[PDB]
Amino acid sequence: TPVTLAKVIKVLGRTGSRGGVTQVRVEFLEDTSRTIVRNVKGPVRENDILVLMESEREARRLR
């Protein structure tokens, strides 16, 4: 199974209708030059590792 392990390096902001989703920037563990912006449900610090079922989508709801 291609599950992707990514480390957050930046929390972009708190998004969502009710503010329940986090905008974060994550680089990949296997190669740290593959940054991507994702949506995270629960609470996050920096230096936390996520798991990505599909590793190719960019997170909407910017600025």
Partner 1 sequence: SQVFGVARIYASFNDTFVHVTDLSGKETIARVTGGMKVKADRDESSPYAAMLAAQDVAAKCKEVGITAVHVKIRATGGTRTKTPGPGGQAALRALARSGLRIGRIEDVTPVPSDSTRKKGGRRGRRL
Q: Which residues bind partner 1 (CB under 8 A)?
A: 56-58
Cα separation, 6 vs 44, in Å, equals 13
Residue number with CB closer to partner 1 (31 or 56): 56
Closest approach, Cβ 13 to partner 1, in A, equals: 20
Residue number with CB closer to partner 1 (37 or 44): 37
Closest approach, Cβ 60 to partner 1, in A, equals: 8
Residue 26 exposed, middle or buried by CB count within 10 Å (0-12, 13-18, 19+) = buried
Interstrand relation of 49-52 and 4-15 (parallel, antiparallel or unpaired)? antiparallel
